[PDB]
Amino acid sequence: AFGRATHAVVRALPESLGQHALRSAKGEEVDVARAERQHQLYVGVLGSKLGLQVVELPADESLPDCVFVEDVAVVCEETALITRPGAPSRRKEVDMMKEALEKLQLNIVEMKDENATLDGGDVLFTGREFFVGLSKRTNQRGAEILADTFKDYAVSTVPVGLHLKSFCSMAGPNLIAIGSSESAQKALKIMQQMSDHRYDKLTVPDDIAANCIYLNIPNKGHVLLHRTPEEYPESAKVYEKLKDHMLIPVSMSELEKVDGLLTCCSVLINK
Ligand SMILES: */O=C(\[N])[N][C][C][C][C]([N])C([O])=O
Numbered sequence: 001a002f003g004r005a006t007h008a009v010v011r012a013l014p015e016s017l018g019q020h021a022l023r024s025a026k027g028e029e030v031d032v033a034r035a036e037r038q039h040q041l042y043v044g045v046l047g048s049k050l051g052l053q054v055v056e057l058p059a060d061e062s063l064p065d066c067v068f069v070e071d072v073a074v075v076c077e078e079t080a081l082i083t084r085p086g087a088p089s090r091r092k093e094v095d096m097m098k099e100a101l102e103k104l105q106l107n108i109v110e111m112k113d114e115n116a117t118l119d120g121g122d123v124l125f126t127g128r129e130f131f132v133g134l135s136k137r138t139n140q141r142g143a144e145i146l147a148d149t150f151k152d153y154a155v156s157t158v159p160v161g162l163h164l165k166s167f168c169s170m171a172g173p174n175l176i177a178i179g180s181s182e183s184a185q186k187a188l189k190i191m192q193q194m195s196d197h198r199y200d201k202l203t204v205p206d207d208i209a210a211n212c213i214y215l216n217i218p219n220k221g222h223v224l225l226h227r228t229p230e231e232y233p234e235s236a237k238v239y240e241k242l243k244d245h246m247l248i249p250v251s252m253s254e255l256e257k258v259d260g261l262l263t264c265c266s267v268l269i270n271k
Pocket of ligand 1: 021022087090120122259261263264
């Protein structure tokens, strides 16, 4: 039953995020207080509103990017792959996630291979298979350690934004939310070519807005957190057509300046 979760692991953002977090382009100053309000609302949604049991990890001032828990672990059924992030300075974020995932009683596999890198952001799990983006953060070797870790599922690579999921994510069972850029469309074509199964697409005009969180929640049904009309009015109009989904608009305008999107800030676990 695709999209079932019971627990979410999140991590508070440090003050140092505003000045020190990595970012692909020069942009507006981060309002850290607003980032913090935004992250608290996102956590309220997962935990309070949807009834996930949320594990809130503490902020660490020396890891400015520690809010982006998605990059440090990939979880599938009862197994957590603790990644080796492509940004060397992010590698230490791994320790606290490992301990949290142990306490959730997952089987833990650690990427230790000094020649392997992988960000969880480069990883798209469709319910049937994995697509893994080969980017500046995720290499071949990292993708192979992922394949060797989740033996029950097919894994395929796609050349890559920062990550594969900078422009796609699952919006439902068999439904790939996808951006409209040359990049997003070239990647999707490769993904579609490499798999026998036929996925449906939800094409949005804003690549960044194709990053959403889908959940299947008992007594709720299909649930989708997506970017707001205020941030991306033309993409929100697309999500609005999902009449069988509970649609929840979530802002991430602040974290967006350091390249974070909706999926970057939780690890969703079914237990
Ligand atoms: O979107 C995901 N999964 N991660 C965003 C990480 C952004 C961060 N500033 C970095 O690693 O550069």
